[PDB]
Coordinates of C-alpha atoms and ligand atoms in Angstrom, one line a residue:
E1 CA -15.3 28.8 8.9
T2 CA -17.2 30.3 5.9
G3 CA -20.8 29.1 6.5
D4 CA -20.6 29.0 10.3
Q5 CA -22.9 31.2 12.3
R6 CA -22.0 32.7 15.7
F7 CA -24.7 33.3 18.4
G8 CA -23.2 34.7 21.6
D9 CA -20.5 32.2 22.7
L10 CA -21.7 29.4 20.4
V11 CA -21.0 28.4 16.8
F12 CA -23.4 26.6 14.5
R13 CA -22.7 24.6 11.3
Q14 CA -25.4 23.0 9.1
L15 CA -24.4 19.4 8.3
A16 CA -27.5 18.4 6.3
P17 CA -30.9 19.9 5.3
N18 CA -32.3 19.2 8.8
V19 CA -29.2 18.7 11.0
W20 CA -26.9 21.3 12.6
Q21 CA -23.9 20.9 14.8
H22 CA -23.6 23.1 17.9
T23 CA -20.2 24.1 19.3
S24 CA -19.7 25.6 22.8
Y25 CA -16.4 26.4 24.5
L26 CA -15.2 26.0 28.1
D27 CA -12.8 28.8 29.0
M28 CA -10.0 26.9 30.8
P29 CA -8.2 29.8 32.7
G30 CA -4.7 29.1 31.5
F31 CA -5.6 27.4 28.3
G32 CA -8.5 29.3 26.6
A33 CA -11.5 27.8 24.7
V34 CA -12.0 24.0 24.6
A35 CA -14.7 23.1 22.1
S36 CA -17.4 20.6 22.5
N37 CA -20.0 19.6 19.8
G38 CA -23.6 18.5 19.9
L39 CA -26.4 18.2 17.3
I40 CA -29.7 19.8 16.6
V41 CA -32.3 17.9 14.5
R42 CA -35.4 19.3 12.8
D43 CA -38.1 16.5 12.7
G44 CA -41.1 17.8 10.8
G45 CA -42.5 20.4 13.0
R46 CA -40.3 19.9 16.1
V47 CA -36.6 20.1 17.1
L48 CA -34.5 17.4 18.9
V49 CA -31.3 18.3 20.7
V50 CA -28.3 16.0 21.4
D51 CA -26.0 17.2 24.3
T52 CA -26.0 20.4 26.3
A53 CA -23.2 22.9 26.1
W54 CA -20.6 23.2 28.9
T55 CA -22.7 25.6 30.9
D56 CA -26.3 26.6 31.5
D57 CA -25.7 30.1 29.9
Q58 CA -24.3 28.5 26.8
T59 CA -27.2 26.0 26.7
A60 CA -29.7 28.8 26.8
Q61 CA -27.9 30.3 23.8
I62 CA -28.5 27.1 21.9
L63 CA -32.2 27.2 22.6
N64 CA -32.5 30.9 21.6
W65 CA -30.6 30.2 18.4
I66 CA -33.1 27.5 17.6
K67 CA -36.0 29.9 18.4
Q68 CA -34.4 32.6 16.1
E69 CA -33.3 30.4 13.2
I70 CA -35.7 27.4 13.2
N71 CA -38.7 28.7 15.1
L72 CA -39.9 25.2 15.9
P73 CA -40.6 23.9 19.5
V74 CA -37.8 21.7 21.1
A75 CA -39.6 18.4 21.9
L76 CA -36.8 16.6 23.7
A77 CA -33.0 16.4 24.4
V78 CA -30.8 13.4 24.9
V79 CA -27.4 13.7 26.7
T80 CA -24.7 11.3 25.9
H81 CA -22.9 10.9 29.3
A82 CA -22.6 12.4 32.7
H83 CA -19.7 14.9 32.3
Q84 CA -19.8 18.7 32.1
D85 CA -19.4 19.0 28.3
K86 CA -22.5 17.0 27.7
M87 CA -24.7 17.6 30.8
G88 CA -23.3 20.9 32.1
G89 CA -26.5 22.7 30.9
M90 CA -29.3 20.4 32.2
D91 CA -30.7 23.2 34.3
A92 CA -31.1 25.4 31.2
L93 CA -33.1 22.6 29.4
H94 CA -35.3 22.1 32.4
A95 CA -35.9 25.8 32.9
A96 CA -36.9 25.9 29.2
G97 CA -39.4 23.1 29.7
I98 CA -37.6 20.5 27.4
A99 CA -38.1 16.8 28.3
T100 CA -34.7 15.3 29.0
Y101 CA -33.4 11.8 28.5
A102 CA -30.1 10.1 29.5
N103 CA -28.8 6.5 30.0
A104 CA -30.1 5.3 33.4
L105 CA -26.5 4.9 34.5
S106 CA -25.8 8.6 33.5
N107 CA -28.7 9.6 35.7
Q108 CA -27.3 7.5 38.6
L109 CA -23.7 8.8 38.2
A110 CA -24.8 12.4 37.7
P111 CA -24.8 13.5 41.4
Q112 CA -21.4 12.0 42.0
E113 CA -20.2 13.7 38.8
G114 CA -21.6 17.0 39.9
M115 CA -24.2 17.0 37.1
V116 CA -28.0 17.4 37.2
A117 CA -29.8 14.2 36.2
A118 CA -32.2 14.1 33.2
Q119 CA -35.9 13.6 33.8
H120 CA -36.1 10.3 32.0
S121 CA -33.9 7.2 31.8
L122 CA -33.1 5.2 28.8
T123 CA -32.4 1.5 29.1
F124 CA -30.6 -0.8 26.7
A125 CA -30.8 -4.4 25.5
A126 CA -27.8 -6.7 25.6
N127 CA -27.2 -5.9 21.9
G128 CA -26.9 -2.2 22.8
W129 CA -30.1 -0.9 21.2
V130 CA -32.3 1.3 23.4
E131 CA -35.4 -0.3 24.9
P132 CA -38.1 1.5 22.7
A133 CA -40.5 2.1 25.5
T134 CA -37.9 4.2 27.3
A135 CA -37.4 6.4 24.2
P136 CA -41.0 7.3 23.2
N137 CA -41.4 9.5 20.1
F138 CA -37.7 9.8 19.4
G139 CA -38.7 10.2 15.7
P140 CA -35.5 9.7 13.7
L141 CA -33.1 9.5 16.7
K142 CA -31.8 5.9 17.0
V143 CA -30.0 5.5 20.3
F144 CA -27.3 2.9 20.8
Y145 CA -25.2 2.0 23.8
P146 CA -21.9 0.6 22.4
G147 CA -20.4 -0.5 25.7
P148 CA -18.0 1.1 28.2
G149 CA -15.3 3.4 26.6
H150 CA -14.7 7.0 27.4
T151 CA -16.9 6.3 30.4
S152 CA -19.1 3.4 31.4
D153 CA -22.3 5.3 30.6
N154 CA -21.4 6.7 27.1
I155 CA -24.2 6.5 24.5
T156 CA -24.3 7.3 20.8
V157 CA -27.1 8.4 18.4
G158 CA -27.8 7.9 14.7
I159 CA -30.2 10.0 12.6
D160 CA -32.7 8.2 10.5
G161 CA -33.0 9.5 6.9
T162 CA -29.5 11.1 7.0
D163 CA -25.9 9.7 6.7
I164 CA -25.0 11.1 10.1
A165 CA -24.2 9.3 13.4
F166 CA -22.9 10.8 16.6
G167 CA -20.2 9.1 18.6
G168 CA -20.0 11.8 21.3
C169 CA -16.9 11.6 23.4
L170 CA -16.2 7.9 22.6
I171 CA -15.0 8.7 19.0
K172 CA -11.9 10.7 18.1
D173 CA -11.0 12.0 14.7
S174 CA -9.0 10.0 12.2
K175 CA -5.8 12.0 12.7
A176 CA -6.0 12.0 16.6
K177 CA -2.8 11.1 18.4
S178 CA -4.5 9.9 21.6
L179 CA -7.8 9.1 23.3
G180 CA -7.7 12.2 25.5
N181 CA -8.6 12.0 29.1
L182 CA -8.9 8.3 30.1
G183 CA -9.4 9.1 33.8
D184 CA -12.9 7.6 33.8
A185 CA -12.3 5.2 30.9
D186 CA -12.6 1.5 30.5
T187 CA -9.4 0.7 28.8
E188 CA -10.2 -3.0 28.4
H189 CA -13.5 -2.6 26.5
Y190 CA -12.9 0.7 24.7
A191 CA -11.9 -0.8 21.3
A192 CA -14.8 -3.2 21.1
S193 CA -17.2 -0.3 22.1
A194 CA -15.8 1.8 19.3
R195 CA -16.3 -1.0 16.8
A196 CA -19.8 -1.7 18.1
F197 CA -20.7 1.9 17.4
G198 CA -19.5 1.4 13.8
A199 CA -21.5 -1.8 13.5
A200 CA -24.7 -0.2 14.9
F201 CA -24.7 2.5 12.2
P202 CA -23.3 0.7 9.1
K203 CA -24.5 3.2 6.5
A204 CA -23.5 6.4 8.3
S205 CA -20.8 8.1 6.3
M206 CA -20.6 11.3 8.4
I207 CA -19.4 10.7 11.9
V208 CA -19.9 13.6 14.3
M209 CA -18.0 13.6 17.5
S210 CA -17.6 15.9 20.6
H211 CA -14.2 17.3 20.1
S212 CA -13.4 17.4 16.4
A213 CA -15.0 18.5 13.1
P214 CA -17.2 15.8 11.5
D215 CA -15.2 13.0 9.9
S216 CA -15.8 9.9 7.7
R217 CA -16.1 6.4 9.1
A218 CA -12.3 6.5 9.3
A219 CA -12.7 8.1 12.7
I220 CA -14.3 4.9 14.0
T221 CA -11.6 2.5 12.9
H222 CA -8.9 4.9 13.9
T223 CA -10.2 5.3 17.4
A224 CA -10.5 1.5 17.7
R225 CA -6.9 1.1 16.5
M226 CA -5.7 3.4 19.3
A227 CA -7.9 1.8 21.8
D228 CA -6.5 -1.7 20.9
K229 CA -3.2 -0.5 22.4
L230 CA -4.7 -0.1 25.9
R231 CA -4.8 -3.9 26.3
Ligands
OQK1 O1 -9.8 14.9 27.4 C1 -10.3 14.9 26.3 O2 -10.6 13.9 25.6 C2 -10.7 16.2 25.7 C3 -10.0 16.7 24.6 C4 -10.3 17.9 24.0 C5 -11.4 18.6 24.6 C6 -12.1 18.2 25.7 C7 -11.7 17.0 26.3 C8 -12.5 16.4 27.5 N1 -13.6 16.9 27.9 N2 -14.3 16.2 28.8 C9 -14.9 15.0 28.5 S1 -14.8 14.2 26.9 N3 -15.6 14.5 29.5 N4 -15.4 15.4 30.5 C10 -14.7 16.4 30.1 C11 -14.3 17.5 30.9 C12 -13.2 18.3 30.6 C13 -12.9 19.4 31.4 C14 -13.7 19.7 32.5 C15 -13.4 20.8 33.4 F1 -12.2 21.4 33.0 F2 -14.3 21.8 33.4 F3 -13.2 20.4 34.6 C16 -14.8 18.9 32.8 C17 -15.1 17.8 32.0
CA2 CA1 -26.2 24.0 36.9
CA3 CA1 -15.3 11.4 37.1
ZN4 ZN1 -16.5 12.8 29.6
ZN5 ZN1 -16.2 15.2 25.8

């Protein structure tokens, strides 16, 4: 709590001199607020965003918070897979004139998932690293596709010059008792994908994820341990 800022429906937490976490909440009618996290990154004189909020209105609130608190232009956004918690606000980013980037497969699945596709598609080598020509001027964002897990399209992001990596919805916290909704999951490859994310970002000590508070690297090995049990 203490330290967090609220702006409309959203909550913001500073993780590092130039990195903040954004949290938005879906109101599940019977259940109440379900939190989802993304990241905001100040890169010199511009801002980069990872993930939308659940809805367009909430995504607009992120951008307005950036305008109010950082007052630097948002140069691009990258969304980490084609479900509502990470791509629900695409229309808001587009309306705001932010260039948007997603895994090619996310963009291909988006219509069927009821999401709006990003403008640009990222592609990935066999070793999981983004093909650099598809991610121009990403500054410190290092984008890595670990393999199928939470979904087949899930990607992850590390921030150069920080100790932070973002596992999105693939990674659960180190006290988690399950892997959550596995309805679109690849149960066979999940564990290796979790470990691959760990290997991509070997010096990250702060692991940020969609549905828990930032954790140590314990979150990675813990998720992989649970995932091992799906085979
Ligand atoms: O199941 C979990 O792991 C979990 C745990 C805790 C909080 C959220 C989630 C899952 N959120 N989520 C992911 S991750 N990908 N998609 C969705 C989603 C959820 C609801 C809707 C709906 F309610 F609005 F329909 C849509 C998407
Ligand atoms: Ca919409
Ligand atoms: Ca689905
Ligand atoms: Zn999902
Ligand atoms: Zn999620």
